[PDB]
């Protein structure tokens, strides 16, 4: 999944998230066109497939012809009362997209972290099922301890949690950040 954020000179903005689903999608590449086809049908629930111990299939997200599968994507634009864009943000990372987009917003809007810090700051994730809190490797260990004494079971992410690209308006203009977890860099003028 890839997330892109754009702000143009006139103050208009686009937050766009795109996906073929799993790595290399269906693994079907056209030998003629070079197109690699998605495996987005895997984002539907199916009555016969169990993905997680003790989690039933979700009938709201069963396959029907012409239906779109549920997605964790959330390309967002925050706009101020004066009509100017404040933040353009979104993420890649499966079910971690929604929590990581939440964290980037919390980090910048409420904790006061600048955009690059909001993107780079360690993240954590819990999606209720499974019943575990995943934390990234470099999270403040005082956070880990505060979670564990409150009976959360934590586990450390083997790689990282999500990828966030974001632009935030500042007094200096538009501050942009691409996540080092993936190695992107913004560009502008």
């Amino acid at each position: 999944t890839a997330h892109l954020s754009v702000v143009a000179e006139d103050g208009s903005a686009v937050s766009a998230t795109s996906t073929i689903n799993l790595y290399f999608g269906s693994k079907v590449r056209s030998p003629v066109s070079g197109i690699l086809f998605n495996n987005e049908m895997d984002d539907f629930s199916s009555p016969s497939i169990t993905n997680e111990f003790g989690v039933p299939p979700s009938p709201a997200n069963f396959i029907q012809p012409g239906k779109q599968p549920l997605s964790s994507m959330c390309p967002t634009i925050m706009v101020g009362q004066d009509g100017q864009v404040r933040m353009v943000v979104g993420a890649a990372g499966g079910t971690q997209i929604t929590t990581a987009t939440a964290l980037a917003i919390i980090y910048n809007l409420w904790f006061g972290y600048d955009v690059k810090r909001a993107v780079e700051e360690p993240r954590l994730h819990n999606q209720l099922l499974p019943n575990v809190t995943t934390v990234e490797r470099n999270i403040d260990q005082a956070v880990t301890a505060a979670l564990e004494t409150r009976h959360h079971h934590t586990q450390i992410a083997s790689t990282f949690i999500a990828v966030v690209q974001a632009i935030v308006r500042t007094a200096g203009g538009w501050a942009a950040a691409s996540d080092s977890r993936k190695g992107g860099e913004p560009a502008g003028y």
Partner: peptide, 24 residues
């Protein structure tokens, strides 16, 4: 630090951010 006075593109690959920027 990538602060820009006029316009900005944040993509997950440097060359693609620059392609967006050039379009702007």
């Amino acid at each position: 630090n990538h602060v820009y006075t006029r316009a900005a593109v944040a993509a997950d690959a440097k060359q693609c951010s620059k392609i967006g920027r050039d379009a702007l």
